[PDB]
Amino acid sequence: DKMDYDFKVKLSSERERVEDLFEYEGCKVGHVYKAKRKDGKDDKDYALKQIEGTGISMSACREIALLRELKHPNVISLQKVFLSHADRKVWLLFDYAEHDLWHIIKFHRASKLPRGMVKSLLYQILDGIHYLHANWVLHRDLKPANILVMGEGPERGRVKIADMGFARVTFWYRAPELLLGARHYTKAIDIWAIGCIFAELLTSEPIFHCRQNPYHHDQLDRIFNVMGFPADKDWEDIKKMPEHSTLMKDFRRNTYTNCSLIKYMEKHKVKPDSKAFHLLQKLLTMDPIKRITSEQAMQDPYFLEDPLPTSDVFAGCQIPY
């Protein structure tokens, strides 16, 4: 080794190692572990993620670079990065989020979601994404599994947006422009996913649920069965999409004539004249330039209507999950 000896040995003597500070024997919930401090002067649960691959890949660099700078109550906090020099592995440390929205929804789909909780989930997701968007950071993979929620403790019921598959399949939350071959991720694509999540919170079922390169026929079909087929006035630049020709070849407007978001939400007991529905409709707009922004959505009168959103999404209730 050509590096200074005294420099090397000093750093190795002082270097924090994950295996010294944390007990993660099993608890394998790359790979993510539930961890406890070995020191004992700490009873809080932590999550440890070992980055997949050796060293630091593009996505890994980016995840670290962004999380290091990002600071908002509804975006998961990076507490620490451990650099394992012998095996060149990277570890990320976070506070453990007891719950996530995929298990929360599954629980309610199985027992069958309180309305106060739905609103507060939506508000906090929007808050977090608004912060990301204002800093020109796009999530690009919003879905219930990526919406964490803190359990008992000082952050009870606080949403934490995560991106647990940042390195890299369900298309239920993908905006139609991506299914028609759009080449760039956008803020609007995130907003469409949020709309999908909101609908799912309101009904307990994924609104664009579909059986398992960018063109995905069955997924678009499911979107049209729910939304109807867009008129040219609804999405004027749909004809600029790379797969537009394919769409014309595969689909006919007439197939979806009796379909609309109003009719879909009606058979799931959600009222079309509700402030909830009108917000949802502004989020699930087919044309991405006609979608509401995250900030516009936070200002919606839905959030001024009784009941107000709460910082603890479980507020006024107990946690059965």
Binding site: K2, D4, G55, C61, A65, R68, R88, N135
Partner: protein
């Protein structure tokens, strides 16, 4: 671009705007081997090496700038003997390229670029060929990340400069010169001591003086401490006199021989 407008709560601002006295105190270790003059010559030299590496790899100026800041941060804390700067330079370019979302320079392309650049542009200083391989880059990368405490997003004066000249309505007259002066500030400690916007203002002022443009009124109606700007202007004015007096190609072999070198295992 990511985290634009977040400077005041950024890791750059909160952890990596250093105190000058702290900086010079840590530098005293190396100043037992090199005079102060030789130290600022060495800095000019490695700035140029990193710029050459960047140009060869066809990286945008912002990536080169980020790489240059990584290099400065490392040696702001540690002695030149800790890790060979010839190894650290290309390691910084490699990490910055990944962080700035330009790409992962391939193994063979990174090593080929360092080998070629040292041989073609710097043979006066390096008669032997670049001796390092990718395993050394990867080991160095880990030491670099550790030292920087994973603080990877770096702000630079180019963006604010762009906004300032657009406001003046002097994009075509003053931008090329002021941008070039910004590049030259990386030959100094300025990026460790001042927010980028201040450096932008200092560079623009110097550009105005050089091109005989009256912009007094414009500068007068800014809400910034002009004392700080004037400190920055004096360093810029000085760097051109230093540039004039420094013959890099004649001096660097001797200066590099004076650098403290890594102690071997005992």
């Amino acid at each position: 671009k990511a985290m634009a407008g977040n400077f005041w709560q950024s890791s750059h601002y909160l952890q990596w705007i250093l105190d000058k006295q702290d900086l010079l105190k840590e530098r005293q270790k190396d100043l037992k081997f090199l005079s102060e003059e030789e130290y600022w010559k060495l800095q000019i030299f490695f700035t140029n090496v990193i710029q050459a590496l960047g140009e060869h790899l066809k990286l945008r100026q912002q990536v080169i700038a980020t790489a240059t800041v990584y290099f400065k941060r490392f040696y702001a804390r540690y002695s030149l003997k800790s890790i060979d700067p010839v190894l650290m330079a290309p390691t910084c370019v490699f990490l910055a390229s990944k962080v700035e979302e330009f790409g992962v320079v391939s193994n063979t392309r990174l090593i080929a670029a360092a080998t070629s650049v040292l041989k073609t542009r710097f043979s006066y200083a390096f008669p032997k060929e670049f001796p390092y391989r990718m395993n050394h880059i990867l080991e160095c990368e880990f030491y670099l990340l550790e030292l920087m405490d994973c603080c990877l997003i770096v702000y630079h004066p180019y963006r604010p400069l762009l906004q300032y000249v657009q406001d003046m309505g002097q994009e075509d007259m003053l931008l090329p010169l002021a941008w070039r002066i910004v590049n030259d500030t990386y030959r100094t400690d300025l990026c460790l001591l001042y927010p980028p916007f201040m450096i932008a203002l200092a560079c623009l002022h110097v550009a105005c003086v050089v091109q005989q443009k009256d912009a007094r009124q414009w500068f007068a109606e800014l809400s910034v401490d002009m004392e700080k700007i004037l400190e920055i202007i004096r360093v810029i004015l000085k760097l051109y006199e230093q540039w004039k007096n420094f013959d890099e190609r004649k001096e660097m072999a001797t200066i590099l021989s004076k650098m403290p070198k890594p102690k071997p295992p005992p």
